[PDB]
Amino acid sequence: LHFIDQHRAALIARVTNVEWLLDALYGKVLTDEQYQAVRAEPTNPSKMRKLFSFTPAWNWTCKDLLLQALRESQSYLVEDLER
Amino acid sequence: LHFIDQHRAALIARVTNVEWLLDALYGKVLTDEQYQAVRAEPTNPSKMRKLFSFTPAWNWTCKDLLLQALRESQSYLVEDLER
Amino acid sequence: LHFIDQHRAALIARVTNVEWLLDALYGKVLTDEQYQAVRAEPTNPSKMRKLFSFTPAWNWTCKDLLLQALRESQSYLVEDLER
Amino acid sequence: LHFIDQHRAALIARVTNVEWLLDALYGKVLTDEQYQAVRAEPTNPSKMRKLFSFTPAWNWTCKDLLLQALRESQSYLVEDLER
Amino acid sequence: LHFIDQHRAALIARVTNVEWLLDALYGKVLTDEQYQAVRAEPTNPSKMRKLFSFTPAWNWTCKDLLLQALRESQSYLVEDLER
Amino acid sequence: LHFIDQHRAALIARVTNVEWLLDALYGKVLTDEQYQAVRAEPTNPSKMRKLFSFTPAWNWTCKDLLLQALRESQSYLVEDLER
Amino acid sequence: LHFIDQHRAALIARVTNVEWLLDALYGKVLTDEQYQAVRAEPTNPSKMRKLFSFTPAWNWTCKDLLLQALRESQSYLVEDLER
Amino acid sequence: LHFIDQHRAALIARVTNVEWLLDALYGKVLTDEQYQAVRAEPTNPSKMRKLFSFTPAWNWTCKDLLLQALRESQSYLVEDLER
Amino acid sequence: LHFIDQHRAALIARVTNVEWLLDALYGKVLTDEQYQAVRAEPTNPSKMRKLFSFTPAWNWTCKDLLLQALRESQSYLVEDLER
Amino acid sequence: LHFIDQHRAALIARVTNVEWLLDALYGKVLTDEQYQAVRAEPTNPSKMRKLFSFTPAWNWTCKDLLLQALRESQSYLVEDLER
Amino acid sequence: LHFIDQHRAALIARVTNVEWLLDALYGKVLTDEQYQAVRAEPTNPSKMRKLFSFTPAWNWTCKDLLLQALRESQSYLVEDLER
Amino acid sequence: LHFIDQHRAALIARVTNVEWLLDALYGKVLTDEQYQAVRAEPTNPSKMRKLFSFTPAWNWTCKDLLLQALRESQSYLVEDLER
Numbered sequence: 001l002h003f004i005d006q007h008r009a010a011l012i013a014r015v016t017n018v019e020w021l022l023d024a025l026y027g028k029v030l031t032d033e034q035y036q037a038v039r040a041e042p043t044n045p046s047k048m049r050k051l052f053s054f055t056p057a058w059n060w061t062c063k064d065l066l067l068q069a070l071r072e073s074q075s076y077l078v079e080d081l082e083r
Numbered sequence: 084l085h086f087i088d089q090h091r092a093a094l095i096a097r098v099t100n101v102e103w104l105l106d107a108l109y110g111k112v113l114t115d116e117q118y119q120a121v122r123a124e125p126t127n128p129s130k131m132r133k134l135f136s137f138t139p140a141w142n143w144t145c146k147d148l149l150l151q152a153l154r155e156s157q158s159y160l161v162e163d164l165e166r
Numbered sequence: 167l168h169f170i171d172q173h174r175a176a177l178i179a180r181v182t183n184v185e186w187l188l189d190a191l192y193g194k195v196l197t198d199e200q201y202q203a204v205r206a207e208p209t210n211p212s213k214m215r216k217l218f219s220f221t222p223a224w225n226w227t228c229k230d231l232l233l234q235a236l237r238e239s240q241s242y243l244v245e246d247l248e249r
Numbered sequence: 250l251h252f253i254d255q256h257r258a259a260l261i262a263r264v265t266n267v268e269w270l271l272d273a274l275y276g277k278v279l280t281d282e283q284y285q286a287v288r289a290e291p292t293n294p295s296k297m298r299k300l301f302s303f304t305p306a307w308n309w310t311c312k313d314l315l316l317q318a319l320r321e322s323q324s325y326l327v328e329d330l331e332r
Numbered sequence: 333l334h335f336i337d338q339h340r341a342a343l344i345a346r347v348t349n350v351e352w353l354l355d356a357l358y359g360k361v362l363t364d365e366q367y368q369a370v371r372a373e374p375t376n377p378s379k380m381r382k383l384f385s386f387t388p389a390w391n392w393t394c395k396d397l398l399l400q401a402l403r404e405s406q407s408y409l410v411e412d413l414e415r
Numbered sequence: 416l417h418f419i420d421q422h423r424a425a426l427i428a429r430v431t432n433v434e435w436l437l438d439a440l441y442g443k444v445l446t447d448e449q450y451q452a453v454r455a456e457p458t459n460p461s462k463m464r465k466l467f468s469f470t471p472a473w474n475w476t477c478k479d480l481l482l483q484a485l486r487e488s489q490s491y492l493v494e495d496l497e498r
Numbered sequence: 499l500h501f502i503d504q505h506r507a508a509l510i511a512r513v514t515n516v517e518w519l520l521d522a523l524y525g526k527v528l529t530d531e532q533y534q535a536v537r538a539e540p541t542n543p544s545k546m547r548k549l550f551s552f553t554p555a556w557n558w559t560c561k562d563l564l565l566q567a568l569r570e571s572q573s574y575l576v577e578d579l580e581r
Numbered sequence: 582l583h584f585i586d587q588h589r590a591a592l593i594a595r596v597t598n599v600e601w602l603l604d605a606l607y608g609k610v611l612t613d614e615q616y617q618a619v620r621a622e623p624t625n626p627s628k629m630r631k632l633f634s635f636t637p638a639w640n641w642t643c644k645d646l647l648l649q650a651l652r653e654s655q656s657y658l659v660e661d662l663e664r
Numbered sequence: 665l666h667f668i669d670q671h672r673a674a675l676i677a678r679v680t681n682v683e684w685l686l687d688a689l690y691g692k693v694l695t696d697e698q699y700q701a702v703r704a705e706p707t708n709p710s711k712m713r714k715l716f717s718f719t720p721a722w723n724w725t726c727k728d729l730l731l732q733a734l735r736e737s738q739s740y741l742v743e744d745l746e747r
Numbered sequence: 748l749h750f751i752d753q754h755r756a757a758l759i760a761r762v763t764n765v766e767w768l769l770d771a772l773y774g775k776v777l778t779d780e781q782y783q784a785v786r787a788e789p790t791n792p793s794k795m796r797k798l799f800s801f802t803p804a805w806n807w808t809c810k811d812l813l814l815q816a817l818r819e820s821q822s823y824l825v826e827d828l829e830r
Numbered sequence: 831l832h833f834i835d836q837h838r839a840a841l842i843a844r845v846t847n848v849e850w851l852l853d854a855l856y857g858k859v860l861t862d863e864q865y866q867a868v869r870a871e872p873t874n875p876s877k878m879r880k881l882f883s884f885t886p887a888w889n890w891t892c893k894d895l896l897l898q899a900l901r902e903s904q905s906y907l908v909e910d911l912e913r
Numbered sequence: 914l915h916f917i918d919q920h921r922a923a924l925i926a927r928v929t930n931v932e933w934l935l936d937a938l939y940g941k942v943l944t945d946e947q948y949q950a951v952r953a954e955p956t957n958p959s960k961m962r963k964l965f966s967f968t969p970a971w972n973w974t975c976k977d978l979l980l981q982a983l984r985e986s987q988s989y990l991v992e993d994l995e996r
Contacts, residue, residue, distance in 0.1 A: 014139050015140065016139060023175050026174065027171075036293060036294070037292050037295075040291045043700040043704055076141065076142045076144065077140045092688060095687055096862075098804055099800070099804040103778075103780065106340070107341065115388055116209065119385070120208070120209050125870040126863070128863050132687075160806070180388050181389060182386045185460075186365070190424055197266070197269075202624045203624050222265060223325075223326045225328070228325060240389055242390065243389050246391040355510055364428075377780050378784075428554070431552045432529070432552075438962075442921070447843070451873045451874060452873050455873055468597075471597060472597040473658075475661075488529075495557040531956070534956045604839050604843070605839060613677070618710075678886050680884050680887040681863075681887070683863065684863065740859070740888065741889070744890075755856065755857070756854065790946065800869075844969050845970060846966070847947070849946070910972040
């Protein structure tokens with residue numbers, strides 16, 4: 001939801017595990033060519049920037065799934081960020 | 084805590100026992116694929132580098148547990164470093 | 167078949183023996199340079215992803231043989247996954 | 250023949266091994282400068298788009314050679330596509 | 333079961349008889365090649381760590397068999413563990 | 416000849432004496448650094464795969480010589496395999 | 499035959515006379531270098547493991563010969579185990 | 582000479598020992614930085630492609646030296662090649 | 665200071681230890697994203713070029729620290745350099 | 748103290764009794780895992796090198812105790828060395 | 831000096847004792863991290879390549895010291911090479 | 914000379930007394946570490962291989978001395994082999 005958009009800078013500068021997020025979000029909201037497009041990007045902040053460049057085409061449900069994926073992957077990160 | 088960040092270079096260049104540290108930190112702050120990635124790295128300083136590249140996503144508690152693990156494993160190392 | 171696609175994440179995150187999958191599937195669906203490329207990848211989930219990136223060109227028969235290889239290798243893994 | 254342009258979308262979306270096609274077609278119809286031009290393109294669908302962008306300058310013989318190269322590389326892919 | 337996962341560090345740090353464990357687990361869960369791979373590992377803790385690296389593919393039954401093997405082999409070790 | 420390629424998986428999974436083959440094939444088709452590289456590999460199936468990863472450069476005569484060495488060393492193995 | 503791999507653990511754990519067995523199996527399926535290799539192990543279980551690691555290359559005839567050798571050498575073991 | 586570029590695809594697909602070629606050709610036609618760049622290439626066919634990417638700047642003498650290095654390294658490979 | 669700028673070509677072509685320089689310069693003049701970006705660059709001269717690309721934004725003090733790092737790390741390299 | 752690293756080559760090349768040294772250093776500076784790791788090393792100089800690879804993590808006190816162990820254990824070595 | 835650079839291929843392909851060379855060169859021209867990096871390299875020619883990758887930063891004195899170390903270790907090797 | 918490496922396989926497969934050879938070649942060609950390393954090898958053919966892997970650094974004189982040692986040790990072996 002709006003949480004990921006309200007903390008764009010922190011998500012860009014602090015996410016360390018993009019691989020699990022891409023695996024979780026594949027097929028339902030990510031098409032494959034986008035998967036190889038974002039995967040070939042060299043460094044983690046750049047991959048986060050590329051991934052969030054595709055958000056404006058998403059609905060509430062897509063952001064909800066992304067937020068759930070972040071909570072499942074790094075609960076401590078979102079817990080710190082919300083505080 | 085801030086200790087491991089302020090002494091990053093010394094931690095990279097001087098610590099020698101990494102895989103015990105991974106076992107101590109496994110299951111709470113590191114996941115399985117991250118464990119495999121950090122373990123396959125050949126040299127000890129490079130493994131420390133791979134581990135430290137994962138720090139930015141961590142909160143205060145993760146660094147606290149890491150400091151506890153280092154104190155438990157090499158008390159003499161941290162004792163010398165803090166001086 | 168569709169089984170490997172609809173459990174893509176589980177195959178990425180849980181398969182531990184990729185070597186026998188390669189040497190069994192060699193000569194019919196993977197060529198030499200592809201085998202060298204997938205084998206040089208360091209970590210097991212990363213090799214799984216490298217192999218799965220080649221799937222979109224495959225037919226029903228290739229996925230059927232791949233599934234048969236999984237069933238022959240780890241019957242328990244596929245048995246747990248299907249449940 | 251007409252197979253490659255009548256199924257342009259499938260070739261763009263499903264070809265996974267492009268370097269074998271490139272070096273097979275090198276020298277006879279492909280000169281170097283566009284070889285490094287296409288080789289620097291990051292993801293496989295994009296390289297397929299770049300390669301297909303040069304097709305309007307090809308005659309029947311060149312596209313027949315390309316079809317033969319595809320048949321030699323992945324017989325299963327063309328067999329599925331023709332179906 | 334979950335017992336071997338919740339006490340992973342202690343099982344790594346204390347188990348000294350890997351030989352009879354590998355003998356008992358051969359065939360039903362363990363094939364020849366990775367048995368050879370684990371048998372070439374120099375130290376006992378490293379052998380346990382390599383063995384545990386292959387657990388994510390296991391189901392409940394495999395973990396139960398491993399727990400039974402540990403109970404049969406070292407009653408004192410597990411008896412210390414639950415307490 | 417084609418025999419060693421058509422049963423590649425069986426050769427990977429069943430040959431146990433790589434040392435005599437390496438001694439027999441040294442000098443004429445094996446180079447010194449090649450021998451050092453293949454000898455440093457830990458496990459027998461991995462050594463066999465390292466050896467077969469270098470076969471595509473071989474001609475008919477080299478494969479025939481290797482098959483002759485196999486027949487000389489383990490006649491029973493090739494006899495069972497051909498049946 | 500299937501007997502030796504059906505009860506591998508008990509054979510490792512109970513058989514006590516290895517020198518006679520190696521003498522019986524020498525020359526026909528065991529090479530001399532294998533003979534010194536297996537002889538160098540300190541304990542009886544280690545020698546038995548070194549021998550059994552060489553079984554995957556064996557055919558039915560070799561397993562039958564080994565079964566006959568064990569039957570002729572240690573009867574009490576075979577009738578006790580088969581029950 | 583023209584031999585190496587007329588058989589370019591075979592050289593890409595079948596050369597297995599490129600490291601000796603890099604060792605021999607260093608200092609006279611290969612400079613340090615490109616040697617390091619090609620040395621970091623993952624797979625042997627990719628190494629061959631990277632090395633041949635530098636050919637258009639070579640004269641007859643450099644190609645002759647490379648051909649002589651191929652002959653002295655793997656006589657069987659070339660001998661099969663022209664035939 | 666001006667020393668590193670006046671010998672730019674020598675620093676690009678002769679520096680062999682990039683790892684310790686990045687470890688030393690981290691935190692004060694290098695950001696996290698800069699460290700990750702430079703760390704993924706394949707070969708040492710390329711990493712030197714990438715590091716020098718950000719120099720125009722540096723003051724006298726940053727170049728002084730960089731020069732001190734070079735002097736203490738490899739005294740022989742600089743000592744040859746000004747001579 | 749600083750004595751041990753200034754004569755590192757002679758310490759590697761001449762020390763013959765390692766088991767007693769590891770017994771003396773066990774527990775206070777040496778953990779069980781690294782004890783097993785160093786003890787499994789084949790040759791005495793190699794064991795010394797494995798031990799010395801662990802020095803950078805040590806403080807003055809650990810080196811002082813190791814020096815005392817050498818002095819009390821082998822007198823001829825140190826009495827030849829310091830001169 | 832220039833001697834080791836002019837005979838680089840022979841040094842790569844013929845040196846058999848690397849560890850003594852590293853111990854001789856440790857401390858004054860080799861740092862700890864480089865020592866660990868070269869140590870993990872599997873094969874002797876490959877460790878020679880890794881060591882020679884660090885030459886460009888060296889001055890005349892460092893190469894002279896390396897030449898002296900080779901003369902001290904294998905006088906016969908350099909004696910044959912110079913001829 | 915060329916005699917020992919032209920009959921390398923027979924030397925590996927038939928030489929039975931290595932301790933006398935190491936005593937004869939100690940010091941002049943063999944270093945202390947080299948002697949300890951070759952001694953720790955368990956089996957005689959493996960010891961012969963360990964010794965022969967160190968021959969490429971030898972000149973004509975070392976090979977001549979080794980041939981003289983073999984002739985002095987086992988006249989029957991060389992007499993049979995030369996035929």
